[PDB]
Design a protein around this ligand. Structure first.
Ligand SMILES: [Bi+3]
Ligand SMILES: [Co+2]
Ligand code: NA
Lengths: 106, 106, 106
């Protein structure tokens, strides 16, 4: 899977979170999101393929995934305890970050 | 703004956690600390301004701020469980790491 | 410590978690694992010494340690809630990821 596939996986699991009812579905979708984000952090996005891996652009690209993962973790902690609608509301803020990172580097 | 202002934000929110009264204030201060630590991880400290962004020194700098981020996460997870005193005790460890990073990279 | 010693610390604390009785031991071993993974993010495997510190191989190395850190976080959050057995089960899968990362870069 490339970076685009990871972005698509993030978006699909965000859809699953939006269409979720219990906390187990939310937990599974958030674990999938974390795995996809960690896989995409290793990749080079299409916009930065003309840059060296040592460029500051790639460093900022990798650091943005830290914010992404912290938001994923906030949602996952809201889901681990019991609050499902709160986890969905937190993932609503997560979709903004996901799609902004997607459209910024594609 | 810059790395020094991020360190000042970290110190101010550490003092806020020290003077905190409930879990909401601790969580807010720790979220602000997480944001400031990410911003500082995106920055270049004064001592390392003569090093390339991909030098081992800068990599170790970003890893040290990752350590700070994980300690902030532990404090925030302790705060989300309603343990305000334990969250503040964990934030006492944050103060040592912040002071060490300040003295090491200023 | 270098990469091999950090991996050894990870494996020792995994064995401690496997043969743990209470939650405090699991939490202490997981904190040691977190410290070891964070420190190993600054290390270089002997077969990648000639490579660039920001080369895609080293990027995959550090982000694999990020994956380890997030799994450690899941185990530690399970242990904080008293779920010692779920934490041990998550540590079982964590050992698989540790062994995969070991076989990949050794
Ligand atoms: Bi938690
Ligand atoms: Co957590
Ligand atoms: Na880097």
């Amino acid at each position: 899977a490339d970076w685009e596939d990871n972005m698509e996986t993030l978006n699909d699991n965000l859809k699953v979170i939006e269409k979720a009812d219990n906390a187990a579905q939310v937990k599974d979708a958030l674990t999938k999101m974390r795995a996809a984000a960690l896989d995409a952090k290793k990749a080079t996005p299409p916009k930065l393929e003309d840059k060296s891996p040592a460029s500051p652009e790639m460093i900022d690209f990798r650091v943005g995934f830290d914010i992404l993962l912290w938001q994923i973790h906030d949602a996952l902690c809201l889901a681990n305890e019991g609050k499902v609608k709160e986890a969905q509301a937190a993932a609503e803020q997560l979709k903004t970050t996901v799609n902004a990172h997607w459209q910024k580097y594609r």
